[PDB]
Design a protein around this ligand. Structure first.
Ligand code: A1LWH
Lengths: 329, 289
DNA sequence: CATCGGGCATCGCGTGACAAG
DNA sequence: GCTTGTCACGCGATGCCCGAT
């Protein structure tokens, strides 16, 4: 018995009824605090109010029941195909919505991000750029957001648009809708292969460096099988353009002495990626005359490949060229 | 100042602004439900409205709505076993100007450019996938499409597969579930076969011709050259082979990605295999004028 | 038609218990 | 063994309601 105690008991029982109705699993609801309960219910109301204005499957001439089952999860399928997460943010930099997959990419559970300031997730060095993006209306940019999986940040491509967020019922002593960013955030993409595993691999070549054999680890690293490896030309068809002259010099060194010497260069994999290698080419002889080459390579990382490149002995044209390549039969 | 009091006053402010956030949220709920009342009235009206509105935060179609509003695209679920179109969303009509009639009963290979039909194969053999191709649409019209997606075990959990369904006898083991969406005076080096096909493209090409390296590789250089400059550029490419190791310079205009003509000076020379002295490729240094 | 004191309900404030990290 | 934060609670200052003026 106590007046204000019973008043706050009424407040708490209404807060309990509000928490019981949130569209989250009960294991997520039970670990919620009252402030987050109110915040999440506000978020749910604002979302449903916007969808009441903006929204509303298989055309009924292709209709099968398996197709209808798939259509009823079309949304989740699109979400899984994003390789990222959806982000809807308001002019006040409030996370109007974030998809659950944010937990898969940044570690932040969706329950804790909605109706919170998006800058809490964004690098201080990038909040200015993000706010510049928040204010002719399609958007394509990059930003580094907090990464709890690293525990640590992650650079993400944002692709989206600015559309009027209806049904927000903003006021002043009634307001029009303002532009909210509807965007998809995806990770960044690299272009070179680095082996995680020492993965020494040997391959045999003709005297013009045309490949004829390759061991297991070579297949594991370069992506080709034996046949496709040999039917693509000589070895120079796989070498990065910024390296072809160095390998040619070391090939003439091997021709004249039998040994290449430790050389470092890049090779084109089956998926058209560049992998660093430190290699050595030795000549086997038959009846005292050259027969074939046995080139053994160690997979290198880009951090040490670039280090070998900057401490380059000889210098030749195209030394610092960067580019992509292809390879046919 | 004093330890305990600094902590105490900051706790004071923390609780004060906790109450502030609480009240602010309750007035947001007041703005957000049908129908000045006190906070308990607001909470009761809010719980009644939320019960009228009612597990995921959004329904499936709200999630799809957000995705497609953000970055367009259309969902297609094909099989890796044959590329058979198991599913395609309705959003394929605003993306490719094609009905769902055209993709169902087909395979992904029938819907893309023929020259891409093999690249497609490399993306379906045996988690994530990210490629680009050319999809169909009074003669044939192809459009560049960036697809991204993943490989999923078929059939999906929770989707019933009835006995009389056409999928019953399919029995695919894996599927590509993907979304497909539409869409400076320097010099860059390049390598070509003796026919003139880009096989290595310097990244500086975007600064000189505006194309991405992928937009150039695989195509012949003459394809980007003015119809008049073509026989001259071809003669240059053929005479660079006869004069191996010698430099051949030739000026011609190159259609930029903005479809402008840019005058360029290309200097070409062969690459000699140090053993056989045979031509490996042609090195060009394409420079803007 | 107000105005006025009862008693309970709202409401904001500061502090202590307690616990997750 | 300290930090940050949640929750309850004691406590008055007004608030609402309403017979009684
Ligand atoms: C088969 C292919 C991927 C390949 C290889 O397996 C080794 C080499 C190495 C060549 C070389 C050249 C000079 C000196 C030492 C090695 C080049 C290739 O294209």
């Amino acid at each position: 018995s106590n007046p204000s105690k019973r008043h706050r008991d009424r407040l708490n029982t209404e807060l309990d009824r509000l928490a019981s109705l949130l569209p989250f699993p009960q294991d997520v609801i039970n670990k919620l605090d009252k402030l987050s309960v109110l915040r999440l219910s506000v978020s749910y109301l604002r979302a449903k109010s916007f969808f009441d204005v903006s929204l509303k499957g298989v055309q009924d001439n292709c209709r099968t029941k398996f197709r209808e089952g798939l259509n009823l999860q079309e949304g989740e399928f699109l979400l899984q195909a994003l390789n990222g997460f959806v982000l809807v943010v308001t002019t006040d930099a409030l996370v109007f919505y974030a998809s659950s997959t944010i937990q898969d990419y940044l570690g932040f559970q969706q329950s804790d991000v909605i109706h919170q300031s998006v800058y809490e997730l964004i690098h201080t060095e990038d909040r200015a750029e993000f706010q510049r993006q928040l204010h002719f209306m399609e958007r394509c940019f990059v930003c580094r957001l907090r990464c709890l999986l690293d525990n640590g940040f992650l650079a993400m491509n944002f692709q989206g648009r600015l559309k009027y967020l209806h049904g927000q019922n903003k006021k002043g002593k009634i307001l029009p809708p303002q532009l909210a960013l509807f965007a998809i955030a995806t990770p960044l993409q690299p272009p070179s292969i680095l082996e995680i595993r020492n993965f020494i691999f040997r391959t045999k070549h003709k005297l013009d460096f045309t490949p004829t054999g390759c061991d297991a680890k070579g297949k594991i690293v370069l992506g080709y099988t034996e046949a496709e490896l040999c039917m693509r030309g000589t070895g120079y068809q796989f070498i990065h353009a910024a390296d072809m002259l160095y390998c040619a010099e070391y090939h003439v060194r091997m021709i004249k002495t039998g040994e290449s010497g430790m050389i470092v260069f890049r090779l084109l994999t089956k998926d058209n990626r560049w992998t660093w290698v430190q290699s050595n080419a030795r000549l086997v002889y038959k009846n005292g005359r050259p027969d074939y080459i046995i080139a053994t390579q160690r997979p290198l990382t880009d951090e040490e490949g670039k280090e070998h490149l900057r401490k380059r002995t000889l210098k030749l044209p195209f030394m610092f060229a960067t580019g992509e390549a292809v390879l046919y039969e | 100042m004093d330890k305990e009091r600094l902590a105490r006053e900051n706790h004071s402010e923390i609780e004060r602004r906790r109450r502030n956030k609480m009240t602010a949220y309750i007035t947001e709920l007041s703005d957000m439900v049908p129908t000045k009342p006190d906070k308990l009235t607001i909470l009761r009206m809010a719980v009644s409205h939320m019960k009228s509105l009612r597990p995921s935060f959004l329904t499936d179609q709200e999630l799809k709505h957000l995705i497609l509003e953000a970055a367009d695209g259309f969902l297609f679920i094909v099989s890796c076993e044959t590329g058979r179109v198991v599913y395609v969303s309705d959003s394929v009509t605003p993306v490719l100007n094609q009905p769902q009639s055209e993709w169902f009963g087909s395979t992904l290979y029938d819907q893309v450019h023929p020259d891409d039909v093999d690249k497609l194969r490399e993306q379906l053999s045996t988690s994530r996938r990210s490629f680009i191709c050319r999809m169909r649409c009074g003669e044939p019209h192809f459009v560049v499409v960036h697809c991204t997606g993943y490989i999923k075990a078929w059939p999906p959990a929770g989707v019933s597969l009835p006995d009389d369904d056409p999928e019953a006898g399919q029995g695919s083991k894996f599927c590509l579930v993907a979304i497909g969406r539409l869409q400076q005076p320097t010099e860059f080096i390049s390598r070509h076969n003796i026919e003139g096909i880009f096989t290595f493209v310097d990244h500086r090409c975007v600064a000189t011709v505006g194309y991405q390296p992928q937009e150039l590789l695989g195509k012949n250089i003459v394809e980007f050259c003015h119809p008049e400059d073509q026989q001259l550029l071809r003669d240059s490419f053929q005479q660079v082979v006869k004069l191996k190791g010698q430099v051949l310079s030739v000026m011609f205009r190159f259609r930029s990605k903005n479809q402008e003509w840019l005058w360029m000076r290309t200097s070409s020379f062969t690459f000699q295999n140090p053993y056989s002295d045979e031509i490996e490729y042609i090195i060009c240094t394409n420079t803007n004028v």
